[PDB]
Design a protein around this ligand. Structure first.
Ligand code: HEM
Ligand code: HEM
Ligand SMILES: Nc1cccc(CNCc2cccc(OCc3ccc4ccc(N)nc4c3)c2)n1
Ligand SMILES: Nc1cccc(CNCc2cccc(OCc3ccc4ccc(N)nc4c3)c2)n1
Ligand SMILES: C[C@H](O)[C@H](O)[C@H]1CNc2nc(N)[nH]c(=O)c2N1
Ligand SMILES: C[C@H](O)[C@H](O)[C@H]1CNc2nc(N)[nH]c(=O)c2N1
Ligand SMILES: [Zn+2]
Lengths: 411, 411
């Protein structure tokens, strides 16, 4: 039970002991593996909270080489007393930064984790209003965008108290394109965002009804009704998509935004639940070119591109979809690189992740990793992660999924 | 207890109850997922329950459960076990078992075909020469002048583990590989170790780039013997590209018949250690893995050079572009020569239909996402978006150790 993972391309064997620190559950059993299920899975009682805090503070003081020290025991006692009285507790800034960086470090589905320690943490726990949230988010977007030299960042709004006063960003990402159902049956814009684009309109948002309309922010503070805000356009950096060989590619009229900023997850540190914690990095090209542009349930541009390439679209075995998919992804990378906007291709990112795995096994004893999500959605087996065995287990602090607010909110 | 899987592209939800019939273990636990691990002399004691379970399944399928034929057969097997320590399957039971081992193969995307398997009973075989004759007839039947037919040939079951029948080849038809003194490899790197054993056993190697390996066959626990498959039985396809006239000059060819020969077939507790089976290729097995794995023929560089791509930086996706062209050439060559092949779009679409049908008529379809998703263009195939449950059912195909590591040499 000191498990080993083999890379079948290189025969490198790593030994994993970190999984024995794991606490939460995978969803699998000895009789059935749920590793391809998208998502397995109210306030914390006074009891379950102190063990959670103790375990977190134990690993925090170990990381600063002060395990079993005066400061350690004192902080343990201090939090112990705060919980006994207040039925919760507040993190020190140092603890908050550590917790957020390690929630990313532990995100087994994230291929970009070699960067985990270079995370800018914005403490927004003093925020009280949607207008305040808007201000914090604009500052985040501007800092992270950095005129195309993207920088990772997270903004952490106040923690859940009793489930009635939740801070929530209702958008799934800070920047996403609208989607509208057409009278004929098709969809203009992003089909993934049709219900959200409806809620915004069904809320007051005057939609331009374009193909790439930046959605408004929909911000919930202290559990009140959410509020619409328009992100200043000069803060939304966008890349027009063109192809270094094909001039007609520009004519397609495609663009995408530079900042991937996920805003609907829940950050758990020491038992405390941060329901509003938008975070951002930079794109891997396939997220746009493969999934955003070519998923059948998204922009689904594959037919158009192949047609303009004059490919034989009559039989699947001509691999016209594969041919078009590559060209699309060459264009995305070329466009971002041309406009000096940070982006990583899937070969670079998976090579980086293999090196990160080696680092984590060496300096930490392991790295939880979800093969189903780490292997890119194109050209899987020519990237080094395809041939890498991975162990998936759930460490804390962590980012977790949470329900969509409009299914919960007492309106 | 019921379980649901969701297709996130179509929102189709399916309900699995078949996992309740699962006996064997997955390797996972509630605290770790081993879903990406490649690999996670039975006694009288444990054998009759395994037989009973199989015969219950068998007689259920023919709608004779609890019949006099069912009960008599159970008695007959029981007495045969207690008296002879093992038992013999009827021909009907063997055919059923072999088909269901394929039906239960959670890593196999081609299972829509499972009920159309030609089963060759080779349980009367006694020598390696007899094995050679049985395998030649299998290859001729399966090849069928390019109109491939699925087949399996089943040699005698294990007795005391000291008299195993084994096919030492990993596949019936495979190309030799030769490590050169300068560190380079001629032929197929995947087969260097086996090629060496063959050469040691007296095989005169042509030392070419595409040399069909000899069969190395072990009967009744004796030392294995070498045989050369008649070249007229080995159907091969020269690889050319439909637009690139220079592709032929790469000098590539591949064999037509994929015939895995190193797995163990388990039926009712009986172990068939030699059970070669064959179907037909999905194009990506050759074009992605065989040709473009860095640890295989690895022709990506040559193809990319002859296409004159930007090979300086990976973000030009020269590797991705060359991969698509190679896979176009594989499918084009096979189809032009009327040798059965299936592209990864057709094969995955069929699997989804198979899987839905299995959920309807059987209550489930165990499936290993990590293996079902093709090694290129993963997300533009429908299985990428399909949730799957993996669990172990019997009859089954299992891995077994390579014989050269366990064999006791006679001299
Ligand atoms: C800096 C560059 C980064 C890159 C290239 C990157 C890349 C990726 C990719 C490709 C995925 C798969 C998601 C999908 O395919 O839709 C992913 C997932 C994820 N990323 Fe990273 N990421 C980066 C930064 C970050 C940061 C800064 C955080 C948090 C602070 C983070 C947290 C996560 C999490 C939690 C997931 C998995 C979500 C889930 O469980 O479903 N990532 N990332
Ligand atoms: C009829 C056409 C067939 C096609 C197109 C097909 C396709 C495939 C593919 C692509 C794989 C993944 C293997 C890899 O990528 O290395 C696979 C796995 C497998 N196939 Fe099928 N197959 C076919 C027939 C069969 C037959 C006839 C059998 C047995 C009688 C079989 C049993 C298996 C098994 C047991 C595995 C899992 C191997 C493992 O766990 O390593 N297949 N198949
Ligand atoms: N309908 C629904 C509803 C719920 C869940 C899903 C699953 N749907 C996949 C998904 C959902 C949410 C986020 C996500 O992405 C994660 C992510 C996180 C950080 C990143 C940082 C940088 C970067 N470049 N990418 C990142 C991606 C995937 N679907
Ligand atoms: N280095 C190592 C060492 C140990 C184990 C492995 C696993 N190595 C993958 C593998 C091994 C053997 C066979 C195989 O293939 C399965 C298969 C079965 C039937 C097929 C029918 C048709 C078709 N087209 N393909 C089939 C593939 C995969 N690797
Ligand atoms: C590490 C991982 O288990 C291994 O590389 C697997 C991944 N998925 C695969 N899928 C298929 N079809 N064939 C393979 O050989 C593999 N290899
Ligand atoms: C069915 C499957 O769980 C689902 O489609 C997953 C598969 N792998 C993925 N991998 C990444 N990186 N992102 C995804 O959204 C998904 N989707
Ligand atoms: Zn699992």
């Amino acid at each position: 039970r000191f498990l080993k993972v083999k890379n079948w391309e290189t025969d490198v064997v790593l030994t994993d002991t970190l999984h024995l620190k794991s606490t939460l559950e995978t969803g699998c059993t000895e009789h059935i593996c749920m590793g391809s299920i998208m998502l397995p899975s109210d306030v914390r009682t006074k009891d379950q909270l102190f063990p959670l805090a103790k375990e977190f503070l134990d690993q925090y003081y170990s990381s600063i080489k002060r395990f079993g020290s005066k400061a350690h025991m004192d902080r343990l006692e201090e939090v112990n007393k705060e919980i006994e009285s207040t039925s919760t507790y507040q993190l020190k800034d140092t603890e908050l930064i550590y917790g957020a960086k390690h929630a990313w470090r532990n995100a087994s589905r994230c291929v970009g984790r070699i960067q985990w320690s270079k995370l800018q943490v914005f403490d927004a726990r003093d925020c009280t209003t949607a207008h305040g949230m808007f201000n914090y988010i604009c500052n985040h977007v501007k800092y992270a965008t950095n005129k195309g030299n993207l920088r990772s960042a997270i903004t952490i709004f106040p923690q859940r108290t009793d489930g009635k006063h939740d801070f929530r960003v209702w958008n799934s990402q800070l920047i996403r394109y609208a989607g509208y159902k057409q009278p004929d049956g098709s969809t203009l814009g992003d089909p993934a965002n049709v219900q959200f684009t409806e809620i915004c309109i069904q809320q007051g948002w005057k939609a331009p009804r374009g193909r790439f309309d930046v959605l408004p922010l929909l911000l919930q503070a202290n559990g009140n009704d959410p509020e619409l805000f328009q992100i200043p356009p000069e803060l939304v950096l966008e890349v027009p998509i063109r192809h270094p060989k094909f001039d007609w590619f520009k004519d397609l009229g495609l663009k995408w935004y530079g900042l991937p900023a996920v805003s609907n997850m829940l950050l758990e540190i020491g038992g405390l639940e941060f329901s509003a914690c938008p975070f951002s990095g930079w794109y891997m090209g396939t997220e746009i070119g493969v999934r955003d542009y070519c998923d059948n349930s998204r922009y689904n541009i594959l037919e158009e591109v192949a047609k303009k390439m004059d490919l034989d679209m009559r039989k699947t075995s001509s691999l016209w979809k594969d041919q078009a998919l590559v060209e699309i992804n060459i264009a995305v990378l070329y466009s971002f690189q041309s406009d000096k906007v940070t982006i990583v291709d899937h070969h670079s990112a998976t090579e980086s992740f293999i090196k990160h795995m080696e680092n984590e096994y060496r300096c930490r004893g392991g790295c939880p990793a979800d093969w189903v999500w780490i292997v890119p959605p194109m050209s899987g087996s020519i990237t080094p992660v395809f041939h890498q065995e991975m162990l998936n287990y759930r460490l804390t602090p962590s980012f977790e999924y949470q329900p969509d607010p409009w299914n919960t909110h007492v309106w």
